[PDB]
Design an enzyme around this catalytic site. Sequence first.
Site, mmCIF file in Angstrom:
data_model
loop_
_atom_site.group_PDB
_atom_site.id
_atom_site.type_symbol
_atom_site.label_atom_id
_atom_site.label_comp_id
_atom_site.label_asym_id
_atom_site.label_seq_id
_atom_site.Cartn_x
_atom_site.Cartn_y
_atom_site.Cartn_z
ATOM 1 N N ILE A 1 0.410 -1.267 -0.046
ATOM 2 C CA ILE A 1 -0.434 -0.052 -0.256
ATOM 3 C C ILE A 1 0.853 1.660 -0.093
ATOM 4 O O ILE A 1 -0.078 2.400 0.382
ATOM 5 C CB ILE A 1 -1.368 0.275 1.346
ATOM 6 C CG1 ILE A 1 0.336 0.051 2.594
ATOM 7 C CG2 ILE A 1 -1.938 -1.540 1.781
ATOM 8 C CD1 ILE A 1 -0.747 0.430 3.422
ATOM 9 N N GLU B 1 5.316 3.018 0.395
ATOM 10 C CA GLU B 1 6.894 2.777 0.250
ATOM 11 C C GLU B 1 7.069 3.438 1.471
ATOM 12 O O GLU B 1 6.121 4.651 2.113
ATOM 13 C CB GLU B 1 7.557 3.158 -1.078
ATOM 14 C CG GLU B 1 9.155 1.720 -0.422
ATOM 15 C CD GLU B 1 8.962 1.761 -1.392
ATOM 16 O OE1 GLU B 1 8.743 1.011 -2.462
ATOM 17 O OE2 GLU B 1 10.805 2.239 -1.753
ATOM 18 N N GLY B 2 8.110 3.387 2.919
ATOM 19 C CA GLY B 2 7.827 4.296 4.509
ATOM 20 C C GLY B 2 9.873 4.367 3.484
ATOM 21 O O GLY B 2 10.722 3.570 2.705
ATOM 22 N N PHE C 1 12.276 2.376 5.452
ATOM 23 C CA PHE C 1 13.234 1.216 6.039
ATOM 24 C C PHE C 1 12.781 -0.225 5.015
ATOM 25 O O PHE C 1 13.135 -0.844 5.069
ATOM 26 C CB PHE C 1 12.929 0.659 6.838
ATOM 27 C CG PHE C 1 13.477 2.323 8.183
ATOM 28 C CD1 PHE C 1 12.716 2.998 8.567
ATOM 29 C CD2 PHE C 1 14.250 2.177 8.528
ATOM 30 C CE1 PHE C 1 13.049 4.230 9.630
ATOM 31 C CE2 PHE C 1 14.936 2.877 9.618
ATOM 32 C CZ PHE C 1 14.577 4.139 9.722
ATOM 33 N N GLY C 2 11.301 -0.412 4.158
ATOM 34 C CA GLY C 2 10.987 -0.783 3.451
ATOM 35 C C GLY C 2 9.765 -0.478 2.852
ATOM 36 O O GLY C 2 8.391 0.511 2.709
ATOM 37 N N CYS D 1 -5.108 3.526 7.463
ATOM 38 C CA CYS D 1 -5.691 3.873 7.437
ATOM 39 C C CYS D 1 -5.685 4.131 5.807
ATOM 40 O O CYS D 1 -4.800 4.632 5.372
ATOM 41 C CB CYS D 1 -5.088 5.598 7.938
ATOM 42 S SG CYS D 1 -4.876 5.442 9.224
ATOM 43 N N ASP E 1 8.748 17.404 12.155
ATOM 44 C CA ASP E 1 8.052 17.333 11.212
ATOM 45 C C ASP E 1 6.885 17.314 10.236
ATOM 46 O O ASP E 1 6.156 16.505 9.454
ATOM 47 C CB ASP E 1 8.865 15.900 10.193
ATOM 48 C CG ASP E 1 8.741 15.799 8.682
ATOM 49 O OD1 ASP E 1 9.315 15.130 8.413
ATOM 50 O OD2 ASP E 1 8.637 16.194 8.005
ATOM 51 N N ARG F 1 2.479 15.657 3.622
ATOM 52 C CA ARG F 1 3.014 14.212 3.317
ATOM 53 C C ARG F 1 3.154 13.132 4.387
ATOM 54 O O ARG F 1 2.742 11.909 4.343
ATOM 55 C CB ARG F 1 3.764 14.379 2.411
ATOM 56 C CG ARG F 1 5.516 14.431 3.948
ATOM 57 C CD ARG F 1 6.687 14.607 2.800
ATOM 58 N NE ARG F 1 7.784 15.163 3.760
ATOM 59 C CZ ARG F 1 8.097 16.442 4.240
ATOM 60 N NH1 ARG F 1 7.374 17.746 3.523
ATOM 61 N NH2 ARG F 1 8.697 17.035 4.678
ATOM 62 N N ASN F 2 2.841 13.665 5.851
ATOM 63 C CA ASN F 2 3.454 12.904 6.676
ATOM 64 C C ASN F 2 1.380 12.775 7.702
ATOM 65 O O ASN F 2 1.608 12.343 8.802
ATOM 66 C CB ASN F 2 3.910 13.231 8.300
ATOM 67 C CG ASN F 2 5.480 13.008 7.478
ATOM 68 O OD1 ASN F 2 5.755 12.233 6.716
ATOM 69 N ND2 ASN F 2 5.942 14.786 8.022
ATOM 70 N N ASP G 1 3.502 9.842 11.235
ATOM 71 C CA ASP G 1 4.978 9.830 10.923
ATOM 72 C C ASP G 1 5.322 10.309 12.518
ATOM 73 O O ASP G 1 5.709 11.641 12.255
ATOM 74 C CB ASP G 1 5.306 10.749 9.805
ATOM 75 C CG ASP G 1 7.191 10.089 9.727
ATOM 76 O OD1 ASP G 1 6.795 8.862 8.501
ATOM 77 O OD2 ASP G 1 8.238 10.590 9.439
HETATM 78 C C1 LIG Z 1 0.733 3.562 9.932
HETATM 79 C C2 LIG Z 1 0.395 3.530 8.168
HETATM 80 N N1 LIG Z 1 1.618 3.657 7.315
HETATM 81 N N2 LIG Z 1 0.408 4.026 6.127
HETATM 82 C C3 LIG Z 1 -0.725 3.236 6.118
HETATM 83 C C4 LIG Z 1 -1.890 3.665 5.505
HETATM 84 N N3 LIG Z 1 -2.958 3.197 6.312
HETATM 85 N N4 LIG Z 1 -2.029 2.990 7.419
HETATM 86 C C5 LIG Z 1 -0.698 3.133 7.727
#
Ligand SMILES: Cc1n[nH]c2c[nH]nc12
Length: 255
Positions: A17, A19-20, A22-23, A89, A133, A137-138, A151
Amino acid sequence: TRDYEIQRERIELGRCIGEGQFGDVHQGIYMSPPALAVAIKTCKNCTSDSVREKFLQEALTMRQFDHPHIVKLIGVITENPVWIIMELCTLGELRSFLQVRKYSLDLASLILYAYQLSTALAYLESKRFVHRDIAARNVLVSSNDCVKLGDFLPIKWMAPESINFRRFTSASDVWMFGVCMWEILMHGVKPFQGVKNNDVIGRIENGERLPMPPNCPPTLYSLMTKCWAYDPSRRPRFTELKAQLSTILEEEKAQ
Ligand SMILES: Cc1n[nH]c2c[nH]nc12
């Protein structure tokens, strides 16, 4: 810390769903007595303890909070592959949501997201926690009338003192929220688009500010310019912001 340990077999991994840092972030199910929809944050390089410590610091940070507009930590899986389980979310990133729906979201809904955010930030201020931050975007979207702060170098969002001296306070968080509020009313458009990061500070110091977004109530813009007082001691606190956004929202929900 450890009271949040979840055994892996209680987690069903789903589709990616997003990217972050770290992965990959995955949708998934958490089964435990009723099988709930969750977000699984992964970490590719977590076999190295220096990465693992940095990654699990978000879990350590989020454990401290409980608020409707702050993404909830469900648990952790400390064994490799290391995972962080969070509240899902479903509607994703706020920036993308605002863009897609530029002609399907009224002013009232935009002011509502700003209000909701100010409640999460008032809560964090009450816990004396500095976010560092605050940006669109967060922010994540749970439903079309429910956003969450998600975040735990953005020169174009930073207060001058954070740029000049790397000082981060509750006052600098207020500056960033002002920028975030501007991003919301500008339908996910990034601030200072076209300007180089190094030239931002000079513009701020010449009294230059982000312009009034089209269709923004002048009372809401007046609130943003208050967030952008050069002197940090002249900026309002979240308690006052929450209260003013509350009245602005009603001023819109009626007319
Ligand atoms: C936490 C989180 N990071 N990305 C997302 C989508 N729904 N919940 C989250």
